[PDB]
Amino acid sequence: NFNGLKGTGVLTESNKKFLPFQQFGRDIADTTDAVRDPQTLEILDITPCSFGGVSVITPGTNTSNQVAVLYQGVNCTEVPVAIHADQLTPTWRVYSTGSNVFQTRAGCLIGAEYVNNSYECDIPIGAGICASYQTSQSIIAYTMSLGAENSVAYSNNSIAIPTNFTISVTTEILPVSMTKTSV
Amino acid sequence: KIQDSLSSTASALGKLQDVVNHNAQALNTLVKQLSSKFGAISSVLNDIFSRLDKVEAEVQIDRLITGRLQSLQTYVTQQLIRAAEIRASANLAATKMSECVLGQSKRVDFCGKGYHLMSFPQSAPHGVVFLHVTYVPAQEKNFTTAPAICHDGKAHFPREGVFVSNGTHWFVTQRNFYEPQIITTDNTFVSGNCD
Amino acid sequence: DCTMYICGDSTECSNLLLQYGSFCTQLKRALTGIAVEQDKNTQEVFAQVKQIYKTPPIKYFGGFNFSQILPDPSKPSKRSFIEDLLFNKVTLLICAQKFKGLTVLPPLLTDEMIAQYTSALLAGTITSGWTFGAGAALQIPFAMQMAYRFNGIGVTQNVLYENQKLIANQFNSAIGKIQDSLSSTASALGKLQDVVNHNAQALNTLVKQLSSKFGAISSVLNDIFSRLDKVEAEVQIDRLITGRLQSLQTYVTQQLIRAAEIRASANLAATKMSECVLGQSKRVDFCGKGYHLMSFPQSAPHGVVFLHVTYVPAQEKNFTTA
Amino acid sequence: FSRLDKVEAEVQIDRLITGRLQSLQTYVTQQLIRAAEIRASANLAATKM
Ligand SMILES: *[C@@H]1O[C@H](CO)[C@@H](O[C@@H]2O[C@H](CO)[C@@H](O[C@@H]3O[C@H](CO)[C@@H](O)[C@H](O)[C@@H]3O)[C@H](O)[C@H]2NC(C)=O)[C@H](O)[C@H]1NC(C)=O
Ligand SMILES: *[C@@H]1O[C@H](CO)[C@@H](O[C@@H]2O[C@H](CO)[C@@H](O)[C@H](O)[C@H]2NC(C)=O)[C@H](O)[C@H]1NC(C)=O
Ligand SMILES: *[C@@H]1O[C@H](CO)[C@@H](O[C@@H]2O[C@H](CO)[C@@H](O)[C@H](O)[C@H]2NC(C)=O)[C@H](O)[C@H]1NC(C)=O
Ligand SMILES: *[C@@H]1O[C@H](CO)[C@@H](O[C@@H]2O[C@H](CO)[C@@H](O)[C@H](O)[C@H]2NC(C)=O)[C@H](O)[C@H]1NC(C)=O
Ligand SMILES: *[C@@H]1O[C@H](CO)[C@@H](O)[C@H](O)[C@H]1NC(C)=O
Ligand SMILES: *[C@@H]1O[C@H](CO)[C@@H](O)[C@H](O)[C@H]1NC(C)=O
Ligand SMILES: *[C@@H]1O[C@H](CO)[C@@H](O)[C@H](O)[C@H]1NC(C)=O
Ligand SMILES: *[C@@H]1O[C@H](CO)[C@@H](O)[C@H](O)[C@H]1NC(C)=O
């Protein structure tokens, strides 16, 4: 509550150079995000808490109950600081330092360990990360791979004529109509 | 082998089950969505009339008869969208039933993931399945090429076929089977010089 | 999010939104359905192969100059030069002011793999030719291949024999001159940034839409609570929250239309990489404005650029027939 | 206005402005759906051409 400008959020230190008479600082959404303390000319910046949601990466509940959460684009050296509920919540706030925390371009995946060799992938994680439930079973995150780089002996005299074949029969499935409804 | 792949998993028929799933789950939300009060005093409607005077009972029922009136138009709007790609897949289906089955398609990878042979429709719930009989090449062998020749001091090039040799003679083969043949005047024509 | 856009940094609003319930839950499902298809497109446009090829260190392509399109190892990335200008021309404080939950999720694929997929195709279409979209690719040298693509027009192979030297060098000049035409102006790339301009100004309209009073006394939730009775406060705040939620449905119902037309360009570009670069296409004025030879794909920010190498006849003469 | 005073006619007239505004948003939406169908048929003619 600064001069009747109510709200909610944490306060930080700002380097903005307010004019002698200006006091509030707005943004595109016409939301106050920079106020000057009435007590002294110090400039404060108002920021929200840690946000962005959490995208848990779990196999089916038919299989084990192991998880590996994801934080959307947060440098999570600050998630332990933002967490004061470790005693209150079991197996949730403890994830601030769980398995070997890994850092991607889309925030830090927590609860899994990077592996070197590249396979096909199952669960799209983001920014170049997939996972699967393997090894003693745990969560392993890696980088995708269409396959081993097949080197072709390109040459100005080389060609390849197949000498056999196969007649595959694949099934393409197409919808043609939905259910007729009436209200 | 087809029947094993059909029973291999539950995702083989995932592109029809989605339609019945996405057009029966829509109903369930539409039924559930009338439990919301929309800021009124109660979800049920007879109690509103039996608890407040007609002078200001119309204020609240107005907020409720507009919430449902817009909770219902949203279902229609999402239904116009969902009927635009089915109309855009009954046109591709009425096309693979129009060229794969009514003849052979010269398109590459349209009626078959590779060179194409035939097609078959099998009627399915709210859809169709095409047993796209397809050709796919198998193992190969190595050869060296020379797209020219000159024998009688002048060019003489074949009617149709490449000049590939294994080490003994240059042979003629088509583009997806090793099928050689010796040089003969029947498949050979003179065309310009050989320099 | 359901609440980060309406009931952010407040608690008296989060309780009120819960009774509504199934509305914004449908919102999250709509924008999650769009997101998945945004990967079913790029996985289909480029990744129609099962082997990431790569050209050998030898770079003598049939006598035709190809350095422009094939990536140069000396560059930090295996990215072709044209993609440098292509990524340069396209333009993108744009996210730090989106504290309202509009968190642009990054694509699953990254720009290098998309380049890695893209370079596979030119690795494919040049080394393997028109038969690498049908399973096992077959190496094809680039010089004598023309005797077959030309053969699919009506001209005998003798065009590339009796006129090899003049035909061979002519294909060289046109390829190089295109780089200059790419550097001409911004009108050529008008069909890419229009997408990023359309899909970024919409976000800005959504964010500034929060400032609307929507008939309420105050545009901020905290102020309306502190100057009027609690029993009558229910209808006042409920007026505003419906306005925002109605305004949120307008934004999503525009993306459903937008996602339904990029799906067309995601299903026609999946053909020119399946019927056109993988075989001399025959849909007239579809690949080549004229009799067709082949194509050469490239990449771009949220789109694809093609270089359709067409064939247009030159000057003519008249005669007498029977 | 000529019958009911300004003090409360705002909410009374607000019930009528929202009635028309909801109708425009319906009319324009049906155009966006329709305009795609013509665009679909504007390319099944540009091909037969
Ligand atoms: C390359 O493929 C040919 C195809 O069979 C292999 O056979 C060699 O070439 C011709 C085959 O048309 C033979 O010439 C004729 O053979 C018959 C039957 O032996 C003979 O009666 C005739 O008088 C005439 O010689 C040739 O003999 C045959 N063998 C050799 C050693 O040249 C050929 O072996 C293959 N070359 C390779 C794999 O290096
Ligand atoms: C293509 O490969 C198949 C698979 O082996 C070949 O089928 C074999 O044919 C021979 C004689 O024709 C039989 O003795 C084998 O038992 C067959 N294999 C199987 C698995 O049944 C076929 O012959 C090959 N075709 C060509 C032209 O080489
Ligand atoms: C046979 O196939 C091979 C496939 O790699 C072709 O390439 C030769 O491979 C061998 C190794 O098995 C090397 O020793 C040769 O040096 C490769 N050739 C060249 C030109 O480098 C080979 O050319 C094919 N041979 C024929 C006669 O078709
Ligand atoms: C096709 O033309 C290009 C034009 O740049 C050639 O690239 C040049 O190659 C020479 C050596 O052949 C280098 O000295 C130049 O520096 C290259 N140019 C640039 C701008 O770097 C290319 O080599 C030609 N194709 C072939 C097969 O020689
Ligand atoms: C549950 O997982 C097990 C693997 O331990 C698998 O065999 C089983 O089929 C799964 N359940 C269902 C219903 O598929
Ligand atoms: C993330 O935090 C680490 C440790 O404080 C720091 O070294 C790194 O530069 C940070 N990365 C950012 C802010 O992008
Ligand atoms: C994994 O790869 C890194 C470099 O990519 C290497 O330093 C490390 O030794 C590798 N570890 C194993 C177990 O292969
Ligand atoms: C292929 O290229 C190499 C080097 O460029 C050359 O020595 C050889 O003669 C070429 N072969 C043909 C058939 O052009």
Curated annotation (Swiss-Prot), chain B:
Residues 1-38 are annotated as: Heptad repeat 1. Disulfide bonds join 100-111, 150-194. Changing residue 186 to H: In strain: Alpha/B.1.1.7. Glycans are attached at residues 142, 166. Residues 17-61 form a coiled coil. It comes from the Viruses. Subunit of the fusion protein that is processed upon entry into the host cell. Mediates fusion of the virion and cellular membranes by functioning as a class I viral fusion protein. Contains a viral fusion peptide that is unmasked after S2 cleavage. This cleavage can occur at the cell membrane by host TMPRSS2 or during endocytosis by host CSTL. In either case, this triggers an extensive and irreversible conformational change that leads to fusion of the viral envelope with the cellular cytoplasmic membrane, releasing viral genomic RNA into the host cell cytoplasm. This is Spike protein S2'. The lineage of its organism: Viruses, Riboviria, Orthornavirae, Pisuviricota, Pisoniviricetes. The chain holds residues 933 to 1127 of 1273 of the full protein.
